[PDB]
């Protein structure tokens, strides 16, 4: 039933000299960087009414993880934030972690074949409860979190010598004000001369790549942030660093797929973060949307495949948290095929020669052709179930392991 | 005992010199754009009543306007507004003695001038491709015409002795969605490149791009995008120009300030009141507006930002416009230098987000007008509503009688 479908499918997408099983292939390597923080509602394991479930536990997340990446075809990524260090139960300051803090996440990801991937942490810390931390006025806390991003950028390096991989340390930080600033430049100084100090040592970038990463609210931190899109942008330029960005982080109708292009002329590599805003920063679980769909095409029409690295990031604690992780992985997943899936050099020379009427057309033509057909073969052959399947073994694994806890 | 007087001690309290602002103020310089006199006309080759029809007319027109506006200030011409004296000059083909006219007024008037090749409404714009246009013969064309315009900039400067600013701004983008963002921007890149090659002093040109959101007839997709220009810009040791109309909903232009003096020496920008699309409305004495000339005051840079204004309301007398408009940036400006910003800032500095609200916030009721007519008086143009009889003495004797 599935493959002969697939067959019929495959001559669809090949009248137009669409080849899927090259497709497929590219598909097959692309790694999707997921991060840990949705396993334990950003608990992590630091010395010191939402859905049932979480994990706890190093243990606990490390089985939760495998779960998901288990449902989500292909090859992927972990994306670590520094307070899951293990210091064996011996409270460590962040200015002090070290790689072997992070030692057993490592092996375990050389055992399952991942990339690891890193961030400082700078939120939910005493020297953090005044909203500044990078930016903050006083030198002493400014130093804890400049060593401290130090501390981070060696262990991002550990990752990309034990994983001979690089591993991506991004740095984002809450610095702002709730309410009106009376001084915007003072604070943003403070950053760049900050990030001047944590990034004063080279480092292989075989090993690790820096990145910097704006937002422009959050809750506390409504009139004002100190790291802005203007900022990092130009901060990341300057620097020859990485400017990540997160499609939950600008203004509204603001669109990150129509950066995409212009970025890739003036960087070489980008970073992205993938998340739902549903109004503000609220890190719902990535749906196949629109937005998606055409950062795919941007990512895919731009050769962009290998330039820009794919993360996610949200935070849904209302639901299965597996489920999360999977529905959101899948859901770029389909996308990235999706676009491959485009004959993008017609719709190129449609554009080039005025033929707007073709261009809409067929662009709009595509959206229902057969591509559960590929998606679904895709999976029979990655050994991930196939629709809605996998959440039978979402419910197994609640009743049999998450319920328990 | 006057009000003047009661006015600067209630500064004073405060340490705000009042004088020395008004001293600082008298300086400061802004670029009045031309297209608002005879509706983006221009005078090349072939709805409220008396727009100008003519340089002539539009010279005078901006003379009425600048004298009923304190200061001393500037005009932002644009590429269209070549006296060609009665031939035919493509674009590509403007040069200095076009504009010789225009500068020997000026210089008479001790005017600065702005400049802008023009890259819209002509044959090889109608595509909604330029400067990214799939031809080579049509990108040239454009280019040339850039390459131009940089070079009467720096006839500008040289004449007037204050650096011309020269920016480029391009319709480029696309009605309905695209299949290629990409191909395009790698155009406009190659092309800019190509426009900025000759190096000229920056004692006499200064170069600028711009960019725009989306437009009518673009909303889709702008070639020229925000990220676009920031990096090129960047990159190329040129001045953004920020346009306070050209961005997305609720996003600021005063926020982008501060974090742009920290890596460029300076910055241009175009004032208009967006009313939800770029539509060039006058400039008003609004929120926005009071945090633009904040910024531009506490960040030390009054001689970093070059204000220009870009407005074109064809509804109401063009005079008006001008004047109001730039009566507007000039308060705002004022109430930006009656502010205390060192108490503001050890407040911040310090945590007491109680002080910084109350006192941003009682500074709204203190008395501005009292200072702000003074300057009028000692700037010697009318104040109040009293600038509307010289505009309508105008209107009804030459406006009315074209
Ligand atoms: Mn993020
Ligand atoms: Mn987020
Ligand atoms: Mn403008
Ligand atoms: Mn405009």
């Given at each position: 039933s599935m493959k002969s479908q697939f067959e019929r499918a495959k001559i669809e997408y090949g009248q137009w000299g669409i080849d899927v099983?090259?497709?497929?292939?590219?598909?097959?390597?692309?790694?999707?960087?997921?991060?840990?923080?949705?396993?334990?509602?950003?608990?992590?394991?630091?010395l010191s009414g939402d859905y049932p479930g979480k994990a706890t536990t190093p243990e606990e997340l490390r089985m939760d993880l495998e779960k998901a990446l288990s449902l989500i075809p292909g090859k992927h990524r972990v994306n670590l934030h520094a307070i899951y260090a293990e210091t064996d139960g011996k409270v460590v300051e962040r200015d002090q972690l070290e790689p072997r803090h992070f030692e057993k996440?490592?092996?375990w990801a050389k055992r399952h074949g991942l990339g690891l991937?890193?961030?400082?942490?700078?939120?939910?810390?005493?020297?953090?409860?005044?909203?500044?931390?990078?930016a903050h006025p006083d030198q002493a806390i400014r130093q804890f979190w400049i060593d401290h991003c130090i501390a981070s950028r060696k262990i991002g390096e550990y990752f990309g010598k034990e994983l001979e991989t690089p591993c991506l340390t991004n740095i984002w930080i809450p610095d702002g004000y709730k309410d009106t600033?009376?001084?915007?430049?003072?604070?943003?100084?403070?950053?760049?001369?900050?990030?001047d100090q944590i990034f004063a040592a080279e480092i292989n970038e075989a090993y690790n790549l820096d990145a910097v990463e704006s937002k422009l609210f959050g809750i506390g931190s409504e009139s004002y942030v100190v790291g802005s899109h203007e900022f990092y942008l130009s901060y990341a330029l300057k620097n020859d660093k990485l400017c990540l960005l997160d499609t939950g982080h600008y203004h509204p109708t603001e669109t990150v797929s129509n950066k995409i292009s212009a970025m890739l002329l003036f960087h070489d590599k980008l970073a992205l973060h993938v998340s739902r805003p549903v109004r503000w920063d609220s890190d719902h679980v990535?749906?196949?949307?629109?937005?998606?769909?055409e950062i795919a095409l941007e990512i895919v029409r731009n050769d962009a495949l290998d330039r820009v690295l794919i993360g996610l990031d949200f935070f849904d604690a209302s639901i299965n948290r597996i489920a999360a992780w999977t529905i959101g992985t899948r859901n770029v997943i389909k996308a990235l095929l999706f676009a491959m899936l485009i004959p993008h050099k017609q719709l190129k020379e449609w554009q080039?020669?005025?033929?707007?009427?073709?261009?809409?057309?067929?662009?709009?033509?595509?959206?229902?052709?057969?591509?559960?057909?590929?998606?679904?073969?895709?999976?029979?052959?990655?050994?991930?179930?196939?629709?809605?399947?996998?959440?039978?073994?979402?419910?197994?694994?609640?009743?049999?392991?998450?319920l328990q806890r």
């Open positions: 099983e090259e497709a497929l292939e590219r598909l097959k390597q692309v790694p999707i960087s997921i991060h840990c923080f949705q396993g334990d509602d950003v608990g992590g394991f630091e996440w490592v092996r991937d890193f961030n400082p942490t700078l939120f939910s810390h005493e020297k953090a409860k005044d909203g500044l931390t990078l600033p009376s001084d915007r430049l003072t604070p943003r100084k403070r950053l760049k001369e900050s990030l990535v749906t196949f949307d629109d937005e998606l769909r080039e020669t005025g033929d707007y009427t073709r261009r809409l057309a067929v662009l709009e033509e595509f959206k229902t052709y057969p591509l559960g057909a590929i998606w679904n073969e895709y999976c029979e052959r990655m050994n991930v179930p196939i629709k809605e399947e996998w959440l039978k073994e979402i419910a197994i694994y609640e009743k049999e392991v998450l």
